[PDB]
Design a protein around this ligand. Structure first.
Ligand SMILES: [Cl-]
Ligand SMILES: [Cl-]
Ligand SMILES: [Cl-]
Ligand SMILES: [Cl-]
Ligand SMILES: [Cl-]
Ligand SMILES: [Cl-]
Ligand SMILES: [Cl-]
Ligand SMILES: [Cl-]
Ligand SMILES: [Cl-]
Ligand SMILES: [Cl-]
Ligand SMILES: [Cl-]
Ligand SMILES: [Cl-]
Ligand SMILES: [Cl-]
Ligand SMILES: [Cl-]
Ligand SMILES: [Cl-]
Ligand SMILES: [Cl-]
Ligand SMILES: [Cl-]
Ligand SMILES: [Cl-]
Ligand SMILES: [Cl-]
Ligand SMILES: [Cl-]
Ligand SMILES: [Cl-]
Ligand SMILES: [Cl-]
Ligand SMILES: [Cl-]
Ligand SMILES: [Cl-]
Ligand SMILES: [Cl-]
Ligand SMILES: [Cl-]
Ligand SMILES: [Cl-]
Ligand SMILES: [Cl-]
Ligand SMILES: [Fe+3]
Ligand SMILES: [Fe+3]
Ligand SMILES: [Fe+3]
Ligand SMILES: [Fe+3]
Ligand SMILES: [Fe+3]
Ligand SMILES: [Fe+3]
Ligand SMILES: [Fe+3]
Ligand SMILES: [Fe+3]
Ligand SMILES: [Fe+3]
Ligand SMILES: [Fe+3]
Ligand SMILES: [Fe+3]
Ligand SMILES: [Fe+3]
Ligand SMILES: [Fe+3]
Ligand SMILES: [Hg+2]
Ligand SMILES: [Hg+2]
Ligand SMILES: [Mg+2]
Lengths: 164, 164, 164, 164, 164, 164, 164
């Protein structure tokens, strides 16, 4: 693997880790403001993100490289409401999406067909990630013009994305 | 909850999160240096620490507080030996243990009995942690002053501590 | 299909056939030199390469072309060590990998998307091949600077990579 | 999604629908001319083509677009024979293949990796499609030079690809 | 079969095909305006219409006729609201119901009892269809004077006329 | 029931009896001329026409009338070929169809709704009968213009069921 | 083992390998000329031949020798038709048969009773091989004086020699 691709893969690993912690932290905000269902959702999703993290971790070790976990910025933020929080989440998943595309671009330009192939899993998962987080914005924009409706989506989020 | 206990509980949460990443990182070093068994052991243990972390996360939120994930220092380190790695593992667990003892002590002197009770789970865990990582160092100082001993410890670690 | 892709696909088919025989031959050397475990591993792998070969055979026939089995060079070789043997195994797989990358590249620049798609199966396989044969070299450079280490790698290889 | 891509994808959705209706229509001609087995095979394939259409439709909607089903030209046609009819199915699947490769190319050169990834399902499918239709024509050339020949291929057609 | 009957049956087959495509199109409006339950309902019902279409297709073939898929008018349309959309679906099923009655009447009138008998399936189907779509119109007018209500109807639509 | 209706229904039971006997006699011809598969089919179908007869028998007894089996004309006929035989089974089922239409019409015209309803079963059945016997004539014309094609049609006929 | 017998065994191993590749190549010719059933047969038989190859490979290793895979001649040939191809196959199996007899002869003349015993498996399998390939010539000479019959044996070959 070229040093370029090793580092870009390594950096996405780190971004995948940050995303785990961000959703964890966001679940805390949810709990502190009584949205137990949102909190359960983010907590489950934080674990998914760790899984994404580990898949890159393993590609790196499998190709004879040493994964490097860098300084991880605090994910703490103030959120004005549950709507803004999920705005931030979809916005963040779009950043992940861009970064995966930059990674596939670099793979293609360097003729690193193994890494381009590896990254297809992330290209398609990121498609499912945007679908999921936008539907949450969309359910909120629908039911959430009232205090009685915020309680209802919270109940949905409680079991969203577990029906396996 | 007294604000000193909140801060401390929050410190320990972050230390457990850090430990998670430490062992994950160390798992990386192991694989890069050919010890796939130590690697699978440490990956399994990284996941455990994440549970230790979340149990503190949950206690803070249950008590009406907002846990704060802080910056994580990079666990990256270029170890000279499997031996130098597990020496630092044990060192690190003794530190965790110390910090749990300090938190228990503080609970006692603030007459925070709910927190002292809560922490007994960690005091108990840490005794098992220190046993586990001491038994690994022990296994190294016996079998492996050789590549054909380090080979066999690694064999053992591949399945070490796997529930039944 | 463009006649350059036909020729190349046909080259790769023949290279996979050759690889089959190479590992079979190497299996012979192992048994003659007392390593029955490496031998059973390599026999199992020879069979795999035959499947890699036939998947290319099938693609050529599916696309209206007639695959041509060419002369196979003798894989015979008098290796100095189990180590010299698996070094050449890894070397050989890196070459296979290179040739698959060259075929993917050619598919791209000829805008042969059906073939690029077809080859993703090989790009993916080769990542697993390189991992497998690198992990074997690794296992040798650790345990076995001795007959009582070469004994144990051979034990492992006897069942190495056996599906569940 | 870039506007060029939206429109190409939409046009291909529309081509899949037409394809469904073309094969539905072709099953009628077959039933009317005694080829109840060819009729049945085409019935099944019409159905498959509708699932190819739905998949595009959902990709457009998943990406926040609004697919638009345009006016569909009557697929009605006369055919001089069963051989001729299957010649037109094969020509028509090649047109679909060509169109899918144009989409794949457009995605590549616009660095739309999510759509490139999405379209791989089709590249893959269309290879199986040409294989299937090629072998129906190959079967017609071999056995079906006679009146009873047409009877045996029809009998084969009735259970070919097993989707009833 | 009398020619009046063939043409009317074939017109009806085409109307069912159009109805399929209309509901599929309607499912996009729904998806693009956030009503994923409505959309999934319509999507499942587009499939049902395709089977209504095939059943007429087969009756024409079984009676020695050649059915003909004509040019299909684009189903695209603007809808000011979810209430406007389900209004139009209901008007449309009433139109189908009407056309089926004209067919039934034409069959009595031509003393075509075999066609009259075949149409009974559709007569009773359209009764179930008017029931279903009415029950939607109705469940709209009740729950959803507000955007809070629209949420639950959509949630209902997602499983309506489904399982077990 | 009205007097004209009783005798029409009694006429039709007799026609169904005759049909049972006709097909019995046809399978006899089939055996004598070596088409044992055709014979098995026609034998099974004879058994079906008896059930048709018994069902009109039972409708007559159940409405308080006394069904009368009339003299049956001998169905004996010395057919020039299996083609001529199956042509006449098909003319015959058309006559039965026609007579069921005349009975359905009569029942409408005399407001005898209970008999009209009863007959619906025959109307749908005759549709299934014309399909099935056409489907045989159609096979005969596709793969029976010789000595080697009869062999497979006969083979086919031997397990061709009449139900669904 | 005497060097004579080691080499003759080794050479038969090589002939058994060539035969694997010859049948593989022949299956390609079959597929390219539409005989999918013949192709499936040869492909299955190619695998058998590899098994024969491996049985000699193992006798050699089991007797303390190193199997040697020699240059393998390309098996590519032009065949005028499916009859000539199977003429070549039976002709080739007769060569294998002769070579096995020469081998048993040499074993007997050298008083190598272990090798003579080992070779009995090949003597009897070669009897079954000639039976099988001659029956194919014989089925061809029977059904294959027409284009309609070549299609029929192909269908047989599809499952010939799998009924286990
Ligand atoms: Cl690095
Ligand atoms: Cl982007
Ligand atoms: Cl950027
Ligand atoms: Cl950038
Ligand atoms: Cl890909
Ligand atoms: Cl894939
Ligand atoms: Cl302490
Ligand atoms: Cl444990
Ligand atoms: Cl490379
Ligand atoms: Cl494997
Ligand atoms: Cl078109
Ligand atoms: Cl249009
Ligand atoms: Cl056309
Ligand atoms: Cl026409
Ligand atoms: Cl024709
Ligand atoms: Cl093309
Ligand atoms: Cl409209
Ligand atoms: Cl329904
Ligand atoms: Cl009488
Ligand atoms: Cl008469
Ligand atoms: Cl009539
Ligand atoms: Cl009246
Ligand atoms: Cl030798
Ligand atoms: Cl001989
Ligand atoms: Cl000789
Ligand atoms: Cl000789
Ligand atoms: Cl013997
Ligand atoms: Cl024996
Ligand atoms: Fe992720
Ligand atoms: Fe994500
Ligand atoms: Fe811990
Ligand atoms: Fe610990
Ligand atoms: Fe390979
Ligand atoms: Fe390989
Ligand atoms: Fe298609
Ligand atoms: Fe309908
Ligand atoms: Fe409807
Ligand atoms: Fe009857
Ligand atoms: Fe009948
Ligand atoms: Fe053999
Ligand atoms: Fe053989
Ligand atoms: Hg892919
Ligand atoms: Hg014997
Ligand atoms: Mg034409």
């Amino acid at each position: 693997l070229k040093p370029e691709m090793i580092e870009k893969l390594n950096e996405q690993m780190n971004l995948e880790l940050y995303s785990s912690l961000l959703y964890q932290q966001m679940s805390a905000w949810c709990s502190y403001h009584t949205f137990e269902g949102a909190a359960a959702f983010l907590r489950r999703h934080a674990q998914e993100e760790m899984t994404h993290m580990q898949r890159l971790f393993d590609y790196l070790t499998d190709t004879g490289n040493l994964p490097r976990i860098n300084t991880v910025e605090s994910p703490f933020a103030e959120y004005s409401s549950l709507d803004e929080l999920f705005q931030e989440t979809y916005k963040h998943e779009q950043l992940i999406t861009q970064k995966i595309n930059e990674l596939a671009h670099a793979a293609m330009t360097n003729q690193d067909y193994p890494t381009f192939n590896f990254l297809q899993w992330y290209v398609s998962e990121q498609h499912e990630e945007e679908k999921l987080f936008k539907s949450i914005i969309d359910k909120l924009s629908l039911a959430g013009k009232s205090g009685e409706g915020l309680y209802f989506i919270d109940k949905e989020l409680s079991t969203l994305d577990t029906q396996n």
